C-alpha cells in the first residue's frame, strides 16, 4: 500500500527512537560511572605516588 | 574542440512538448577512412533513459546535412530538472560506432519564450569509470605489543545486484593472505535482501610486528545464492602492494596503535584485485 | 513525482532498519561496558584500600 | 475560480512531501554515519577499558606482594 | 482531494520530525561517546602512572627485606 508504507516506516522510526533513547540514558549512567572512575583513578595514582615515596624512604632506611 | 554543431531548441506550450532541431554539423575529424566521416546524431534527454532518437546516416561527409526535428513529450515544470544531450557519432560497418563528440545544455537555463537557435562547439565527453560496484566501511585496530589485529567489519553500501529479479544476499568474507597463499578464511553473517547491509562484527588475527609489512588482508563482499557457488560482488585489499585509500588506511592503522580506525573503501572487480596480488 | 517519493520512503525505511540493528548492538555493548566499569571501579576501591593501609603501615614503620 | 490554485496547491504539497523525503534521506544518512562513528569509538574505549582493568589487576597483584613484604617486616 | 494529499503530507512531515529527533539523538550519542572517550583516556593515563608507581614501590619493598 501507499499509506501502509508510511505507517510501517513511521513505526520503525518510532521504535528506533525508543531504543536509542534508552541507549542514550544508558550512556548517561556510563558517563556518571566514568566520571567517578576518573576521580578514583586520579586519587589512586596520587596515593600510589605517595606510597612509592614512602617505599623509597623505608627502603633507603632499612636496606 | 574538433567540431561544431548547429542546433535549434523550442518548447510548444500548447502540446507541452520539446522541439529539438538537428540541422548541420561542421569541422568533423577525418575518421574513419581517409577523407570524410560517416556521421549520425543520437539525441536524448537526461536523466531520461528513454529511447534515444537518431538522425539519418550521411555517407562520406565532414559537413553533414540532417535538417531533421525531434519531439520530446515532456511537462514544462519537469523540464527545469532535465538536460538536453546531443551526441555526434561516426558510423562504422564492421567496427563499434565510435562517438565523435557530445554536449549537454541545461534546460533550466534555456529561454523557451523565444525560439532558440545556436552554434555550439562539440565537447570531448567524459567516459564512465567502469561500473559502480559499491563501497564498504570497516575499522582497523592493531596492537604491536600483543600482535593482535582487530578488523571490525562495519557495513557496506551501493552493492551491485546479482540475483535475477532481486536485489542481493550480501555477506562479507575475509581472506588473510601472504605470498599468494590463503592462510585465514573468516566470514560474517548473511544479511538477506539488502543493498545496504549492516554487520558490526569484530574479527581478530595474529600479526607479529615483524611481518606487519609483509601481510595482505583481502576483504571480499559476495552475494549468497541459495543454489550453487555464491557469486562475488567485489573486493578490496590492504597491506603490501596496497594502493591509494587502502595503503592510507593501513598507514593510519600503523600510525595509530592500540586504536581502531574506521574508513570507507571503493570496491574493485575481483579480476583486477586478484591481479594486483603479486 | 510520486514514484521518487515512495522510493525515497522505501530507502529511508531500510536505512532506519539498519539504524535499529545498530541501536541494539550499541545498547548491548553499552550495558556490557557498564558492567565492566562497575567491576573496574570495585577493583579500584579494593586497591585504594590496600594502598592506603600499606602506606599507613609504611609511614608508621618510619624510625 | 480557486480551481487552478487548488491544483497548484496539490502539486505544491506534493513537491513539499518529495523534498521532505529528500531531507529524510539526508538526515538518516548523517545519523547513520554518526552511529557508525559511535560504534567505532565504543570499540576503542572498550578495548581501552579492558586494558585499564588488566592494569588494575596487575596493580592488585603487585600491591598484594608489597603487602606480603610489609607483613614480613612487621 | 486536498484533504487526502494534505493529510498524507502531514503524516510525511510528522515522519520527518520523528526522524529529526532520531538524528539529533544519534549525533548526541556520538558526542557523549567522544567525551567519555577522552575522559577514559585520562583514566587510562592515571591508571598507567599508578602501575608505574606501584611497580616501583613493590621493587623497593621487595629489595628492602633483602
Ligand atoms: Ca565512416
Ligand atoms: Ca566510421
Ligand atoms: Ca545472485
Ligand atoms: Ca543472492
Ligand atoms: Ca570490551
Ligand atoms: Ca577481561
Residue numbers in the entry:
A (entry chain A): 27 to 89
B (entry chain E): 141 to 418
C (entry chain D): 142 to 204
D (entry chain C): 9 to 82
E (entry chain B): 191 to 256
Reproduce the article's own wording on this structure.
Here we have measured a synchrotron data set from a similar crystal in the same long unit cell' crystal form used for the XFEL-data derived structure. Synchrotron data were collected using the shutterless, continuous rotation method at the Northeastern Collaborative Access Team (NE-CAT) beamline at the Advanced Photon Source at Argonne National Lab on a Pilatus 6M detector (Dectris). 80 cryo-cooled crystals were screened and the best diffraction data (in the long unit cell form) were merged from three data sets collected at three different positions on a single crystal using consecutive spindle angles. Each of the three data sets contained 150 diffraction images in 0.2° frames and an exposure time of 0.2 s. The diffraction images were indexed and integrated using XDS and scaled and merged using Scala. The synchrotron diffraction data were obtained from a single crystal judged to be the best from a pool screened for optimal diffraction, and 4.1 Å was determined to be the maximum achievable limiting resolution with this particular data set. The synchrotron data extended to lower resolution (4.1 Å) and consequently provided less detailed electron density maps. The phases for the synchrotron diffraction data were determined using molecular replacement and refined in the same manner as above. Refined independently from the XFEL-data derived structure, the synchrotron data-derived structure yielded slightly better Rwork / Rfree values than the structure refined against the XFEL diffraction data truncated to the same resolution (4.1 Å). Although the synchrotron data-derived model refined to a lower Rfree value than the XFEL data-derived model (29.5% vs. 32.9%), the electron density maps calculated from the XFEL data set generally contained more information than the synchrotron data-derived maps, even when the latter were sharpened.
